[PDB]
Structure 1
């Protein structure tokens, strides 16, 4: 273990959700993840047990407001008559899955979205496609890049499906095979990957299904710069996001020998989330570190 990131650095993450379909999720992200992170690292007594209830109310409030954007199909978009976003619907899946520990979450809402992605947006080769990009391109983190898009997006959607699996097992029959077809696409193409970001994200996707091994694992691990980070020329934020996915992959692998320099690089970023364009870095860095604090010896 390493020291937990100090609660005080996280106070600004307790945020009102507002706006429409997209921006309501931008608001919901930080409070969701800050409560997740603080619950895991047990900082509530020495910080404000009662501020937790307030955050729980805000989360309840984002969830509730988000249902006003649920389309008949079970998909999501900024507005109810907007064509539904594959990325957004998968992202609502990602956040609500993590919030099952925190508030009432309706399975049918969550699994409905899962089912729609599989049924509507997955290709026969297992790729997921976005037919209606979100307005808020700053909220999709390193996916905003144009290269390696089918692999980055497919890994992103696959990750949501894997995080919804326990909750949706009994009601989405198609789910296990959808997971495998997506894995198949990622595995077949993983070795050709050029981008550190795509390597880290597809690596976490693959690892969760025990498919990151052999030459693919070696690819994953040797893409790290100095054994501590996954980075590309671009915004630093994508690199904190990619390194956080890579840490989740390491944790899945139980590669605790590789872990500590990666945790030290992240901690030394002093990246406390929040702000325009921070949705993916904020969610992912705190998901990763909470997982790290939960798992690591």
Structure 2
């Protein structure tokens, strides 16, 4: 039973100092807590001063020369081997059209060199830290060896005597000894340290090891990025000035660069070879790690959203032929990555062997239903997933999640009503996409049940939408869910106009988020004082997710028109500098929303943009004149750098709207006071023996 694992966990040590009572408060399982606690209590005091598998070594170097060679009469290959720790078995098999197949007998190969040098470097060092290198000399002979060892000179590092100093080290027979070389980096870069060992007179033996050491700037890195709206149709926005940085926590030593990138082709930049269909995908563009299960969808749904745009607007031709291979490679990687999370009954858990999540199960059903477009032919597993999702629908018509992945609403009191509606509207969207999986003649009971489940859920959404106490997020999904599943027009209308009544507008932008009442005391009824010379204020992840749903709802409700134009214009100017948005969930939904808008609003005509930038930096006065157009894929290829502390002056012309965004990255000496408000963290290092003495009493 599992009681054996619970007793084994009870006796296993923990890094933290934990007595059994507080340690048994985390298990939260009665048939595991009883053996866990009793075996801990046994170990806590009575004990003083394997069962299943064994720990066989599992790490092995990659298979070099994993290749096929066209061999005629014979062929000669030259192999280079650094001093081998273990013997290699070189295998080979032949496949010929005339004499069939032959498996060669293996040949063993090892390089057991007499004198071996072993250099180990730290992962990264900050400049003006000191480090004592200890390269280890290995002597495998039956006699002593005296070798002359030195570290080669290199600029930026304080080597002893400039690097020419050499030490005589006697290495005994069949043993190893280190030799200490102290070095102090004075410049932040990637420097190559080369340790050289040569036998002095006694024997003509030698060795050399070269490894790259990463020297980083002092302190901690800090990042700020801002977006500017380029519009020459408005005569007010044909010129603007970007002020320089003046952060009071900035590190003094070393000049920094402000990076800018301008574009008049937002869709191709976002979904093309420089963006979503980059070989690293949007996963590479986002700053966040992607271990969890929900995050795996960032490999599929943005890749699918980019594919739908290129498929239905017909411009795969404007991207390199490597792009199609990138897309299917990302989809295969994401599909493989998520299927590890699938449980036996068709549900999906946030982590491995964790409790199931109704929200994640719905999310995976939605994306993998879309994935059938070019990786189809798997209806059975998606049919299982939707059938489990039907079992989580309560009598209200809403869905319940015992372990939700994403909590987001902050409207107190109504937060439970927001989350229940937001989850239900999200599951309804997933179930609707599930219908497209099975166009089969049979298996209609599942089709009838999901059709009945959606209708009951839409009736639940209609009551809460008509009541009108929902937050902006819940109404955003509900308006899209009702329009998507073609709910009754009376339910569809009240949710749409309740959603529009919460919209905030400024200039050419329309967005949603945090509108419980009147949010400012100087604003006019519908617009706000914001002009193109001012930056676009970056919005939290909640606002991007709500606006993306509202934009998707507007495309289904009307298609194109001003409300979709102003909402998409705000979304394209909320994207981060290198692509993607705040986090995973807002990125996937916004890319789906922008992809649907870009397909509908596409035009073959060519509109252009002229931008002239100029600034006076450390390298003096520099100016860049670029003419851009809607058909021009661009991105990281043409980042332009200016000095961080000097202001940039740009003037814009043309007949199209564009977007300029700026990236400021620099190291800081202090963490200001605009952080650590809602959340807190404290980190301390106590030393091994000091903590051991505190624990052992």
Q: Report the TM range for the smaller structure's normalisation.
A: 0.7 to 0.9
Provide the rounded CA distance (Å) in 2 between the counterparts of 1:9 and 1:18.
18
The answer to whether the 8 A contact 1:25-1:62 is kept is yes
1:42/1:238 CA distance change after superposition, 3 Å: farther
- Counterpart position of 1:291: 596
Corresponding residue number in structure 2 for 1:129: 400
Aligned to 2:477: 201
Residues 218/71 of structure 1: CA separation in 2 closer, same or farther (3 Å cut): same
Q: Secondary structure at the match of 1:130?
A: coil
CA distance in 2, matches of 1:228, 1:98: 28
| Structure 1 residues 215 and 91: CA distance shift in structure 2, 3 A | closer
Query: 2:135 corresponds to which residue?
Result: none
Q: Residue 81 of structure 1: SS of its match in structure 2?
A: coil
Contact 2:560-2:600 at 8 Å conserved across structures: no
Q: Does residue 464 of structure 2 align to residue 180 of structure 1?
A: no
Mapped to 1, the partners of 2:332 and 2:476 lie a distance apart of 32
RMSD: 2.9
Offset of 1:108 from its aligned partner?
1.4
SS of the aligned residue for 1:145 comes to: coil
For the pair 1:281 / 2:553, whether they are aligned, the reply is no
Q: In the aligned structure 2, how far is the partner of 1:244 from the partner of 1:280?
A: 11
Q: Confirm whether residue 218 of structure 1 aligns to residue 500 of structure 2.
A: no
Identify which of 131, 136, 145 aligns with 2:409: 145
Mean alpha-carbon deviation: is it higher for 51-60 or for 124-133?
51-60
Asked which structure has the greater RCO (Cα within 8 Å, sep 6+), the reply is 1
- Work out the CA distance in 1 between the residues paired with 2:501 and 2:552: 16
Higher normalized strand content (fraction of residues): 2
> How far apart are residue 214 of structure 1 and its match?
3.6
Larger Rg: 2
> Contact 2:349/2:361 (CA < 8 Å) preserved in 1?
yes
Match of 1:162 among 419, 427, 432: 432
CA contact (8 A) 2:283 2:298 kept: no
Matches within 5 A, 1:63-142: 63-79=335-351, 81-104=353-376, 106-118=378-390, 120-134=391-405, 140=406
Q: Report which of the two has the higher share of helix.
A: 1
Q: Does 1:13 align with 2:281?
A: yes
Number of equivalenced pairs: 287
| C-alpha distance in 1 between matches for 2:439 and 2:355 | 27
Q: Output the CA distance in 2 between the equivalents of 1:197 and 1:73.
A: 31
1:280 & 1:38 partners in 2: Cα distance? 22
Q: Is the 8 A contact 2:309 2:595 kept in 1?
A: yes
Partner SS state of residue 121, structure 1:
coil
Partner of 1:137: none
8 Å contact kept, 2:349–2:355: yes
- Are 2:541 and 1:237 aligned? yes
* C-alpha separation in 1, matches of 2:471 and 2:380: 36
Output the CA distance in 1 between the equivalents of 2:283 and 2:311: 17
- Judging changes above 3 Å, is the alpha-carbon distance between structure 1 residues 29 and 166 closer, same or farther for their aligned structure 2 residues? closer
2:556 aligned partner: 252
Aligned twin of 2:322: 50
CA distance in 1, matches of 2:485, 2:294: 30
Give 1:186 deviation, angstroms: 0.4
- Which has the larger displacement, 98-107 or 154-163? 98-107
- Asked whether the 8 Å contact 1:190–1:216 carries over to 2, the reply is yes
Separation of aligned partners in 2, 1:22 and 1:247: 23
Distance 2:471 2:333 in 1: 37
Measured in 1, the distance between the counterparts of 2:312 and 2:409 equals 32
Moved more, 182-191 or 225-234: 225-234
CA contact (8 A) 1:25 1:92 kept: yes
The superposition leaves residues 9-68 of structure 1 with CA deviations (integer Å, 9 ceiling, x where unpaired) of: 443535489746444335444434444444445453323232321231221122123223
Mapped partners of 2:493, 2:337: distance in 1:
45
Change (3 A) 1:179 1:296: farther
Deviation at 1:163?
1.7
Q: Mind listing any 5+ residue stretches in structure 1 that lack a counterpart?
A: 135-139
Shift of 1:109: 1.4
The whole-number CA distance in structure 2 between the counterparts of 1:214 and 1:14 is 36
Stretch of structure 1 that moved more, 49-58 or 39-48? 39-48
Unpaired runs of 5+ residues, structure 2, are: 1-263, 516-537, 603-697
